[PDB]
Structure 1
Amino acid sequence: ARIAGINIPDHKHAVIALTSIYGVGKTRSKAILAAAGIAEDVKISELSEGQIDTLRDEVAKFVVEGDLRREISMSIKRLMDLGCYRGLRHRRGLPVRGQRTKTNARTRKGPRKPI
């Protein structure tokens, strides 16, 4: 199935199959399935192309995939270009939301760099 611009996994159940879209998680997929009137347990491969079409049509009101990547990049780029504290943490690759950097900043700082 081709909802938004990417390929949905056909062998899985609708809810998880739809969560494979940048911008749709479990509860947003549940809301999409509940507004479409399709069970979440039905496989996407076992439902008709009209159901695929309305699934696409009400995925389309959620800003998702590349538009969401554009919005997220634009927000982080606005912070970095503005040069606030969150901007300098994004520029230096340090944690932004007040976590400790003496230890355990490893997700933001990448793997360990020996001196």
Structure 2
Amino acid sequence: ARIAGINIPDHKHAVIALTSIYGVGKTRSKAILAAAGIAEDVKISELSEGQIDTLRDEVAKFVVEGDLRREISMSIKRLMDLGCYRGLRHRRGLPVRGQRTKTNARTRKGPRKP
């Protein structure tokens, strides 16, 4: 009931419990269950430990929870100390993909205080 970083829920199905990992979404868990051989509509309460340790190595195949937060944080850090356009937008706290900054972007620039 525990993979590389964290606990997965046990009464949920295999792909849904596998998405609780950072770095594993839907297609990642589909490929993980396809490489493991376990049919995805089983529960972790149904499943024993040998299947989940063959799951452990197959999710060690992917860059997952801790070093993935490390990779994303370091990539934003490299852009931010690089001083480029996207880094400077990451620095001020504005959208970086060319959104409209005139009216919208309360997700990026935060909830509407003043």
What TM-score range do you get, normalising by the shorter chain?
over 0.9
The equivalent residue for 1:96 is 96
Q: Secondary structure at the match of 2:108?
A: helix
Task: Name the structure 2 match of 1:84.
Answer: 84
Identity of aligned residues (%): 100
Could you tell me how far apart the structure 1 residues matched to 2:5 and 2:80 are? Answer: 29
Residues 29-83 of structure 1 deviation map (CA, whole Å, 9 limit, x = unaligned): 0000010000111011101110011011100010100100000000000000000
Q: CA deviation at 1:113?
A: 2.1
Runs of 4+, deviation exceeding 2 Å: none
Q: Which has the higher helix share?
A: 1
Task: Give the TM-score of the pair, scaled to structure 2.
Answer: 0.98
Query: Aligned pairs, how many?
Result: 114
Deviations 1:3-22 (A, max 9, x none): 11100000100001000000
- Tell me by how many angstroms 1:93 deviates: 0.7
Q: Considering only aligned residues, what root-mean-square deviation do their CA atoms show, in Å?
A: 0.6
Deviation at 1:85, TM superposition (A): 0.4
